[PDB]
Amino acid sequence: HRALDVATELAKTFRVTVRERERAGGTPKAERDAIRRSGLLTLLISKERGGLGESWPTVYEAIAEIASADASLGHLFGYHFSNFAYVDLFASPEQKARWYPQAVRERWFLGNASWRVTATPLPDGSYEINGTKAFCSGSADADRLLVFAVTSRDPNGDGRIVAALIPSDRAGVQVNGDWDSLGMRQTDSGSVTFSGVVVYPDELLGTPGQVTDAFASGSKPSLWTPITQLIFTHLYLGIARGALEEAAHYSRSHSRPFGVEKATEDPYVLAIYGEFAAQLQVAEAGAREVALRVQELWERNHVTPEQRGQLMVQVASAKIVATRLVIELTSRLYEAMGARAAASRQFGFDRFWRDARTHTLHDPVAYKIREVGNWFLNHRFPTPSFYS
Amino acid sequence: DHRALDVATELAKTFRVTVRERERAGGTPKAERDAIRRSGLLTLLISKERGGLGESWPTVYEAIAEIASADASLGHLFGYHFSNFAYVDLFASPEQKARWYPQAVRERWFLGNASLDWRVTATPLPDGSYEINGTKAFCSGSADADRLLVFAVTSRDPNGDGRIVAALIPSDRAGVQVNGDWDSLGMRQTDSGSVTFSGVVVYPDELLGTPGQVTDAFASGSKPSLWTPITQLIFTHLYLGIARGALEEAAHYSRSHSRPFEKATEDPYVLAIYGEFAAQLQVAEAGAREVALRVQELWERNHVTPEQRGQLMVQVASAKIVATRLVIELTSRLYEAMGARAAASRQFGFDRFWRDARTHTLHDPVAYKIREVGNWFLNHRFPTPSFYS
Amino acid sequence: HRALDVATELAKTFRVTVRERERAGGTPKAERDAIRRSGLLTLLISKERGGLGESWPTVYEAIAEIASADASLGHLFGYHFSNFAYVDLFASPEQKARWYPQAVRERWFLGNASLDWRVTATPLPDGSYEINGTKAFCSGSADADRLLVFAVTSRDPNGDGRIVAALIPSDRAGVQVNGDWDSLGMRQTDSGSVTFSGVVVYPDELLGTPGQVTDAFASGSKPSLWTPITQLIFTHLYLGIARGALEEAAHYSRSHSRPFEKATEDPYVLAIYGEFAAQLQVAEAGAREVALRVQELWERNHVTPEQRGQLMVQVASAKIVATRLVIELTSRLYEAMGARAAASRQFGFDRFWRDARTHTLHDPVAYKIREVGNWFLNHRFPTPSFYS
Amino acid sequence: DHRALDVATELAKTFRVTVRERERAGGTPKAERDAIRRSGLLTLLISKERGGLGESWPTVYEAIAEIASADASLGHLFGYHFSNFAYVDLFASPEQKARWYPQAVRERWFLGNASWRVTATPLPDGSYEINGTKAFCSGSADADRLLVFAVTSRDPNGDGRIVAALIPSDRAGVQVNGDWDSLGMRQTDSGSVTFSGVVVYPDELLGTPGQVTDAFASGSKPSLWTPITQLIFTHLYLGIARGALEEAAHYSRSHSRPFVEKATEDPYVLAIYGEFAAQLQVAEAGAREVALRVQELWERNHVTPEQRGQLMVQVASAKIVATRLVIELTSRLYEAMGARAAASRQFGFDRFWRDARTHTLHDPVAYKIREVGNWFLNHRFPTPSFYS
């Protein structure tokens, strides 16, 4: 419970300042540093390597809690664990024995950059990275970037995906700072340009094309996608809960009745809260079960495609329900608050819809629906990829 | 749990064979009720020491949903047997449990149900007995019931009028008349018609607590206040079972019989219908499993706080709301994935799923379960314990 | 006014008996004869030819009124005008000069029997065709004075696979109406099969030339109006069922629903009636506008593909809204009426859902939606066919 | 009527060029308000004899929807000018109309609105003194006249009576506070107005104090004011909906990436456009019918309670459907456009949702629904008020 208490207190502090911060956009350095000081970036690192030795259920609940307060910080925090998951699933034990204590002592907050961007092999096993990555979540103030590139000028085969974990201030890396979005405004998800960037052999995650081989095999590293899509699910549930709580506080404190004596006794106000709160309870309860299954497979040495596909179907279902819920709720709750909630821009409630509306487009929910339908009707698991 | 769920799965399989003809006939599914007796599953919650299976609520709930997916009437009868058993177990004395539970095992009891302005009154008789009079309008599973769980309000009672008496009595006790007047849209084999009590004697050793004890237990939040969330989650599992049964039956039809408007199973909109409803079902089923585990956890406590009972009732009400909306939409809209021929032949019988769900979801109005969840979230008021919340 | 009063009085009588009649299925002969005596089957025949000289707006309103009382009779009545429309659009003036006065005198009620088609037309030396095969879903095929029949040419030196259409007596030698209709709803539409055993169709019964209907579809010319006309007939069946269900539910709520004050003052009951009645008003008002456009183009000597395509989009839109409305309200109105409305099978309210659920599947609303979307987004009109 | 609608269409075209930049700043769209002044359209309902255009309500409503599709704030200002004009026309004396209406033509009047906090106290010779602050005052900046409402106080002829007046906005003691800073509808200048000892003369009063209350409760002709005005709101919502749909479709055609060879051929993109375009077509066709009925009753000398009640039910129905439509469409169309539509804030598509989400809260749709349900179930027409 201690880690969840730390996340709850962080979220409490973030609520105080989110309204002003997200209007500005840009990098929430102070808040990222507060997360660094909290230790929670080490949740999944073993105690033996200096981390907290915690589980995915705890990580997911902390993501949802932080997201309920500040969706951009929730996303940054959550995608740090997506990046960490990728490293853990592909790095060697020797790499992790060095990286994880270093991540603990240096308080690493991981960012993401990932085809245009090429990896040219050099004779000593190094690579040179060139090109621009269009969207690069958490690419500012990042202690390391998880970078993906495709091999080029490669006598052993072009187009093979390489991944590496590299310093963000390595020569040739330019974080362009061009993120100016509807919502998720403080996730620094703009472009990063690589000009002759060197990647050393001991920074590489697996071999070229290994991620593609793991996807095609449905093996354990292909857990990365359900893990990450469930991170997104918890962002949407967190935003949903935060919006519901903020609306209810407004209804209790500011809404006027319309033969109604109190707005909090209005039958239609109560119906809106009841319908959305009910769907939220069921979605949150279902999501906890899936998070436990993530942890179970995370601990296995081997994962079959049937185990991975069943999990991906469960995650996709959770994401579909959470997507529909957060998008409806963040818009319709105005009907429970009244005109003054929109007449005063400064109240800032539209942040919840803007944040959810932006992030839920990451990959199309229509095709998560098709994937669940193709499984249920035709017994076909989703084809593993970076989105399914 | 594995053995009991296998037994329930095999029961459900047999029920699917005949449900089309039986539910059209209505009436009492006597043969299937006896099959349930033979299975031993009616004793799931009776301890092994008393002759039962010593199983848990999560097992009961999964078995309810599995049977309901095959035959909603038998799923309801089976599920409400456990609501009746829960009430008995929450109020019965050690002496009553020592007598009744071995007898329930040996006689294979299948429990049925008959319950200020109440029509059924209990008037005191000498020696601690009560006389029951009146007609109970809706009495779930009241036919072929080995014992009836009966409720009445005290009248002409020196110890206080208006108190709720509950008793467990033989259905063949003199003066009990099961009227057999159930003829419904769906849930057609649940025998949920009226029962008329004419001078029916109830003895002290049949009383479930003292008169009014249920009202005290519910107002105090003592352990019997778990009865309503337990029972409302039974209904939730009937709805999720019907939902799953309908989705699986439609999918088989789409695979084997639908024509494309290359193959219907590759149609983008057919796939979207199955994906939308299967996704909601997965989430609802996963949520329902968690709440079932909480039911068992609190069932095992000596004392449940009002906060714990209130939070459970909110979770159960939420599950029931989502399951109600899902089953009502899914059982109607899946025709759009199957095509016109699924309705052109009445005998296909797919409308049974909608009729069953549409009937049972009206048991108590979802609008007021929604208001209860809203009053909790907005105003921090837990629902007031009653027979419905 | 006069025709609509006649239809309203017909519907009143049908409501008295529909609950008992529809349970039995089979042919509602007495009600079909009442429609014959009413004169309304001649609504669109000019006064010159002995008909009423009325307009499609009147026909559509009459269809919806009858459907609100008895969906099977509404369908039978409405599809009579679909059959009539086909005849009017493809028959010669000489054919109509004979047929229409005959249809008036003899009180014709028209029925319907019709790639990989099961029913072939083999040419005979005189210009007749021999029809063979079994046609499924032959709406209104029983007690029909004439059948509109479609067949595909076979063993035809002038081209196989061409569609021929004809209007023939239902007792023509070799025609067997099979009576094999036992459906969820629309139970008295006699939509079973018709078997053609060496049925001779004579040259004066043929509608156009072989394949002319296909060429008219490909041209988007005036005869291709048949589809929007017919799809708007279906739309009015759905609106009529919706109105009938709403009024029947309201009668139950006023006389039978129990409260817990008064059920008719319950805020959630009122919300259900309000939401559906509002959508019904808007859908009905919109359908009247489309019906006026049907009449306008029906009176033109020539119709462009643009006029036809725009009409079909408007019809499809009306059908989409009406389909969603009727399917939702015929199920959800139980939530307003309460448990006793389902506990008493004899109330029979499920007839509305059964009728709507059956008929709305005639062709998939998902593709009507796609057709409207393809027009709005890509400016493509639907490809004319028997369904679009 | 083509000329006036052509003028409105050209105005709307010009507004679309600049709305994205203008609405960001908020404040008063003076240049565009003056463009509307020069157009003559503010005189649509003034007779030609008095220098107006002698046009009808259907033209007004079509113009409102067209302008709203380009700029929701200008559509609202324009529409509410006609609500204000309708109120004046329904209560003004023959003397007042003879003077005001030629003056409104000559001086190109754009009418604003201010309406308890605001009292009217008797002054000598039949004048009143207005004191208090009006909370929301639609179009209160750059207004040639304000329609002002107050409640009599210290009045020997009766306290608590509603007085209305049409006064200059620069009358001594009128302070337009300029405090409108809203989520959407950002250029409607709907902030507060403070009245300090403001004199209102008898020839500025719109009927006697309390007359509006009698006129509404009796169902005399001024009881048309509310359905007229609620239908103006309905056309704002339909205009926003059409504008959003057309803007999204332009983006989908030119910018959306396929997930599928072209986004415009994606089955789920097409389904989104088809669902919303279908509902929009039906709602717009329905709204034309109700607008015609407004005109018909506007021309009547006496309107019965059943005629007014039926009209209000039809208007409330249209508003309910338009409200649900625009709120869903302006959010869900992002799912047809893709992530880049939200990633680039400058696209500015969220303006449609912000505008619609703000204005649809003017009065609660739940009680419009209840009013329609109370009519349909209980045969009770809505009680006339400023909202029903």
Short mmCIF file of N, CA and C in Angstrom, two decimals, chain C residues 172-232:
data_model
loop_
_atom_site.label_atom_id
_atom_site.label_comp_id
_atom_site.label_asym_id
_atom_site.label_seq_id
_atom_site.Cartn_x
_atom_site.Cartn_y
_atom_site.Cartn_z
N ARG C 172 -52.52 -18.94 -62.78
CA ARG C 172 -51.91 -19.43 -64.01
C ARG C 172 -51.42 -20.85 -63.80
N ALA C 173 -51.68 -21.72 -64.78
CA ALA C 173 -51.28 -23.12 -64.66
C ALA C 173 -49.80 -23.22 -64.35
N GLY C 174 -49.47 -24.04 -63.34
CA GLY C 174 -48.11 -24.27 -62.94
C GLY C 174 -47.64 -23.42 -61.77
N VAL C 175 -48.43 -22.44 -61.36
CA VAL C 175 -48.09 -21.63 -60.19
C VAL C 175 -48.62 -22.32 -58.95
N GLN C 176 -47.74 -22.57 -57.98
CA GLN C 176 -48.16 -23.11 -56.69
C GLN C 176 -47.64 -22.19 -55.59
N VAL C 177 -48.57 -21.53 -54.90
CA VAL C 177 -48.26 -20.73 -53.72
C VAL C 177 -48.19 -21.69 -52.54
N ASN C 178 -47.06 -21.71 -51.85
CA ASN C 178 -46.76 -22.83 -50.96
C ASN C 178 -47.21 -22.64 -49.52
N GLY C 179 -47.42 -21.41 -49.06
CA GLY C 179 -47.93 -21.25 -47.70
C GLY C 179 -46.96 -21.60 -46.60
N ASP C 180 -45.67 -21.59 -46.90
CA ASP C 180 -44.64 -22.03 -45.95
C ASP C 180 -44.00 -20.81 -45.28
N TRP C 181 -44.79 -20.17 -44.43
CA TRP C 181 -44.37 -18.94 -43.75
C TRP C 181 -44.78 -19.04 -42.29
N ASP C 182 -43.78 -19.14 -41.41
CA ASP C 182 -44.02 -19.27 -39.98
C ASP C 182 -42.87 -18.51 -39.32
N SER C 183 -43.06 -17.21 -39.13
CA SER C 183 -41.99 -16.27 -38.85
C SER C 183 -42.09 -15.71 -37.43
N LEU C 184 -40.99 -15.08 -36.98
CA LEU C 184 -40.98 -14.40 -35.69
C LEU C 184 -42.05 -13.32 -35.64
N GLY C 185 -42.00 -12.40 -36.59
CA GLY C 185 -43.01 -11.37 -36.76
C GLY C 185 -43.38 -11.22 -38.23
N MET C 186 -44.13 -10.17 -38.57
CA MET C 186 -44.73 -10.06 -39.91
C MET C 186 -45.45 -11.37 -40.26
N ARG C 187 -46.17 -11.92 -39.29
CA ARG C 187 -46.61 -13.31 -39.39
C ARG C 187 -47.74 -13.52 -40.39
N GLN C 188 -48.45 -12.47 -40.80
CA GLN C 188 -49.54 -12.63 -41.76
C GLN C 188 -49.24 -12.00 -43.12
N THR C 189 -47.96 -11.89 -43.49
CA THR C 189 -47.57 -11.36 -44.79
C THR C 189 -47.46 -12.45 -45.87
N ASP C 190 -47.70 -13.72 -45.54
CA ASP C 190 -47.65 -14.79 -46.53
C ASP C 190 -46.40 -14.69 -47.40
N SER C 191 -45.25 -14.61 -46.73
CA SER C 191 -43.97 -14.42 -47.40
C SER C 191 -43.23 -15.73 -47.59
N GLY C 192 -43.96 -16.80 -47.81
CA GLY C 192 -43.39 -18.09 -48.14
C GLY C 192 -42.95 -18.14 -49.59
N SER C 193 -42.89 -19.36 -50.12
CA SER C 193 -42.32 -19.57 -51.43
C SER C 193 -43.44 -19.83 -52.45
N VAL C 194 -43.08 -19.67 -53.71
CA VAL C 194 -43.97 -19.93 -54.84
C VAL C 194 -43.18 -20.78 -55.81
N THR C 195 -43.77 -21.89 -56.24
CA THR C 195 -43.12 -22.79 -57.18
C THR C 195 -43.73 -22.62 -58.56
N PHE C 196 -42.88 -22.47 -59.56
CA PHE C 196 -43.28 -22.33 -60.95
C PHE C 196 -42.91 -23.63 -61.66
N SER C 197 -43.92 -24.37 -62.11
CA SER C 197 -43.71 -25.61 -62.86
C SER C 197 -44.20 -25.39 -64.29
N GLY C 198 -43.27 -25.09 -65.19
CA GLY C 198 -43.64 -24.89 -66.59
C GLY C 198 -44.67 -23.80 -66.78
N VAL C 199 -44.52 -22.68 -66.08
CA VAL C 199 -45.50 -21.60 -66.10
C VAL C 199 -45.26 -20.77 -67.36
N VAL C 200 -46.28 -20.62 -68.19
CA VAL C 200 -46.16 -19.81 -69.41
C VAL C 200 -46.58 -18.38 -69.10
N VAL C 201 -45.72 -17.43 -69.45
CA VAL C 201 -46.00 -16.00 -69.33
C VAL C 201 -46.11 -15.44 -70.75
N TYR C 202 -47.21 -14.78 -71.03
CA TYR C 202 -47.49 -14.39 -72.41
C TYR C 202 -46.94 -13.01 -72.73
N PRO C 203 -46.73 -12.70 -74.02
CA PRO C 203 -45.98 -11.48 -74.34
C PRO C 203 -46.65 -10.21 -73.86
N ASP C 204 -47.97 -10.20 -73.72
CA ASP C 204 -48.65 -9.01 -73.25
C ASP C 204 -48.58 -8.85 -71.74
N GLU C 205 -47.96 -9.81 -71.04
CA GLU C 205 -47.80 -9.74 -69.59
C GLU C 205 -46.40 -9.30 -69.18
N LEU C 206 -45.48 -9.24 -70.13
CA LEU C 206 -44.09 -8.90 -69.86
C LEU C 206 -43.93 -7.41 -69.62
N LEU C 207 -43.06 -7.08 -68.68
CA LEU C 207 -42.79 -5.69 -68.31
C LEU C 207 -41.43 -5.30 -68.88
N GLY C 208 -41.45 -4.52 -69.95
CA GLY C 208 -40.22 -4.17 -70.63
C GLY C 208 -39.60 -5.35 -71.35
N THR C 209 -38.34 -5.16 -71.73
CA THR C 209 -37.55 -6.15 -72.42
C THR C 209 -36.59 -6.84 -71.45
N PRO C 210 -36.06 -8.01 -71.80
CA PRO C 210 -35.17 -8.71 -70.87
C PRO C 210 -33.94 -7.88 -70.54
N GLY C 211 -33.68 -7.73 -69.25
CA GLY C 211 -32.54 -6.94 -68.81
C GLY C 211 -32.80 -5.46 -68.73
N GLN C 212 -33.98 -5.00 -69.15
CA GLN C 212 -34.27 -3.57 -69.10
C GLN C 212 -34.15 -3.02 -67.68
N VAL C 213 -34.56 -3.80 -66.67
CA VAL C 213 -34.47 -3.29 -65.29
C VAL C 213 -33.01 -3.07 -64.91
N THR C 214 -32.13 -3.98 -65.33
CA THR C 214 -30.71 -3.82 -65.07
C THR C 214 -30.15 -2.60 -65.77
N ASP C 215 -30.56 -2.36 -67.02
CA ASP C 215 -30.09 -1.19 -67.75
C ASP C 215 -30.62 0.10 -67.12
N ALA C 216 -31.85 0.08 -66.63
CA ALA C 216 -32.39 1.25 -65.95
C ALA C 216 -31.61 1.54 -64.67
N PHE C 217 -31.27 0.49 -63.91
CA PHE C 217 -30.43 0.68 -62.74
C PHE C 217 -29.09 1.29 -63.13
N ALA C 218 -28.47 0.75 -64.17
CA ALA C 218 -27.15 1.23 -64.57
C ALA C 218 -27.21 2.67 -65.05
N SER C 219 -28.34 3.11 -65.58
CA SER C 219 -28.50 4.47 -66.06
C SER C 219 -28.93 5.43 -64.97
N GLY C 220 -29.40 4.92 -63.83
CA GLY C 220 -30.02 5.78 -62.85
C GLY C 220 -31.19 6.56 -63.41
N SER C 221 -31.91 5.98 -64.36
CA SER C 221 -33.02 6.66 -65.02
C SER C 221 -34.31 6.45 -64.24
N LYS C 222 -35.41 6.99 -64.76
CA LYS C 222 -36.65 7.03 -63.98
C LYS C 222 -37.07 5.67 -63.44
N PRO C 223 -37.00 4.56 -64.17
CA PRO C 223 -37.46 3.29 -63.58
C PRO C 223 -36.66 2.89 -62.36
N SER C 224 -35.43 3.38 -62.21
CA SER C 224 -34.65 3.06 -61.02
C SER C 224 -35.18 3.76 -59.78
N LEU C 225 -36.21 4.60 -59.91
CA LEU C 225 -36.90 5.14 -58.75
C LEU C 225 -37.58 4.06 -57.93
N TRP C 226 -37.77 2.88 -58.51
CA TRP C 226 -38.47 1.81 -57.81
C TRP C 226 -37.83 1.57 -56.44
N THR C 227 -36.49 1.59 -56.37
CA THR C 227 -35.84 1.26 -55.11
C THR C 227 -36.06 2.32 -54.04
N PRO C 228 -35.77 3.61 -54.26
CA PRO C 228 -36.09 4.60 -53.22
C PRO C 228 -37.56 4.61 -52.84
N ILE C 229 -38.45 4.45 -53.83
CA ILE C 229 -39.88 4.37 -53.51
C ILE C 229 -40.13 3.26 -52.50
N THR C 230 -39.57 2.08 -52.77
CA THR C 230 -39.85 0.89 -51.98
C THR C 230 -39.17 0.96 -50.62
N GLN C 231 -37.94 1.48 -50.59
CA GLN C 231 -37.23 1.63 -49.32
C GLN C 231 -37.90 2.66 -48.42
N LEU C 232 -38.56 3.66 -49.01
CA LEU C 232 -39.35 4.59 -48.22
C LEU C 232 -40.67 3.97 -47.77
#
